[PDB]
């Protein structure tokens, strides 16, 4: 309930110990990660990344359509060559339709949001297949694209085989 106070206090400890000031921009692993904003996922901890390893792109659902701007920059300015797409169990984007979220915006804010496309999905493994195939199909994304489901209940990354 004092979030600004808490994160500044923590950051003061982080900076006292900090030794990574000379890391370059371009990610060491030539890797870009796309995943959800979900609070339970520390990407660095889950994948064993360190500072400088991979670009980490996060949005509600980990949607590749919205990650594309960031992935083109990741490859063209950062030299990344590979994408991993990681959707997860118990994702809010599985539970609700565009119409469902628009009703919540009306109820709570009394605002109309009928022109915002919130990009939910109806099946968790389909959404990973769709998002991998999207990036492979894009003329603006180079290199291999691997899909995963992160299991929030176990801490477990599950590779998907995505064809075509």
Q: Applying CB under 8 A, does 32 fall inside the site for a second copy?
A: yes
Burial class (CB in 10 A: 0-12, 13-18, 19+), 91: buried
Q: Applying CB under 8 A, does 58 fall inside the site for a second copy?
A: yes
Number of residues that bind Zn ion (CB under 5 A): 3
Q: Applying CB under 8 A, does 47 fall inside the site for a second copy?
A: yes
Residues 68-97 that bind a second copy (CB under 8 A): 68-70, 72-74, 76-78, 82, 84, 90, 92-93, 95-96
Q: Applying CB under 8 A, does 149 fall inside the site for a second copy?
A: no
Q: How far is the CB of 16 from a second copy (least distance, A)?
A: 8
Q: How far is the CB of 164 from a second copy (least distance, A)?
A: 19
DSSP E strands in 23-155: the ranges are 31-35, 54-58, 82-88, 144-151
Q: Applying CB under 5 A, does 91 fall inside the site for Zn ion?
A: yes
DSSP E strands in 3-119: the ranges are 31-35, 54-58, 82-88
Provide the sign of the torsion angle of the four alpha carbons 6, 25, 53, 133, taken in this order: positive
Tell me how far apart the alpha carbons of residues 62 and 87 are, in angstroms, rounded to a whole number. Answer: 6
Residues 33-72 that bind Zn ion (CB under 5 A): 36, 38
Q: Which does 77 bind (CB under 5 to 8 A by kind): a second copy, Zn ion, none?
A: a second copy
157: enclosing H helix or E strand: strand 156-159
* The dihedral formed by the CA atoms of 96, 130, 54 and 69, expressed in degrees to the nearest 10: -80
Q: Which does 57 bind (CB under 5 to 8 A by kind): Zn ion, a second copy, none?
A: a second copy
Annotated binding-site residue numbers for Zn(2+): 36, 38, 88, 91
Which CB sits closer to a second copy, 94 or 133?
94
């Amino acid at each position: 309930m004092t979030n600004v106070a808490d994160i500044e206090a923590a950051n003061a400890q982080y900076a006292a110990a900090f030794t990574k000031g000379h890391l370059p921009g371009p990610p060491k692993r030539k890797l870009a990660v796309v995943t959800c904003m979900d609070a339970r996922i520390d990407v660095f901890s889950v994948l064993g990344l360190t500072e400088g390893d991979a670009h980490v792109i996060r949005n509600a659902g980990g949607r590749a359509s919205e990650a594309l701007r960031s992935l083109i920059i990741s490859q063209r300015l950062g030299g990344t060559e590979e994408v991993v797409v990681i959707h997860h169990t118990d994702c809010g984007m599985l539970t609700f339709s565009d119409e469902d979220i628009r009703a919540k915006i009306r109820e709570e804010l009394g605002e109309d949001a009928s022109d915002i496309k919130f990009l939910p999905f109806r099946d968790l493994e389909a959404s990973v297949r769709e998002d991998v195939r999207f990036l492979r199909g894009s003329r603006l994304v180079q290199g291999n694209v691997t899909g995963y489901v992160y299991e929030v209940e176990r801490g477990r990354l599950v590779r998907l085989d995505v064809s075509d």
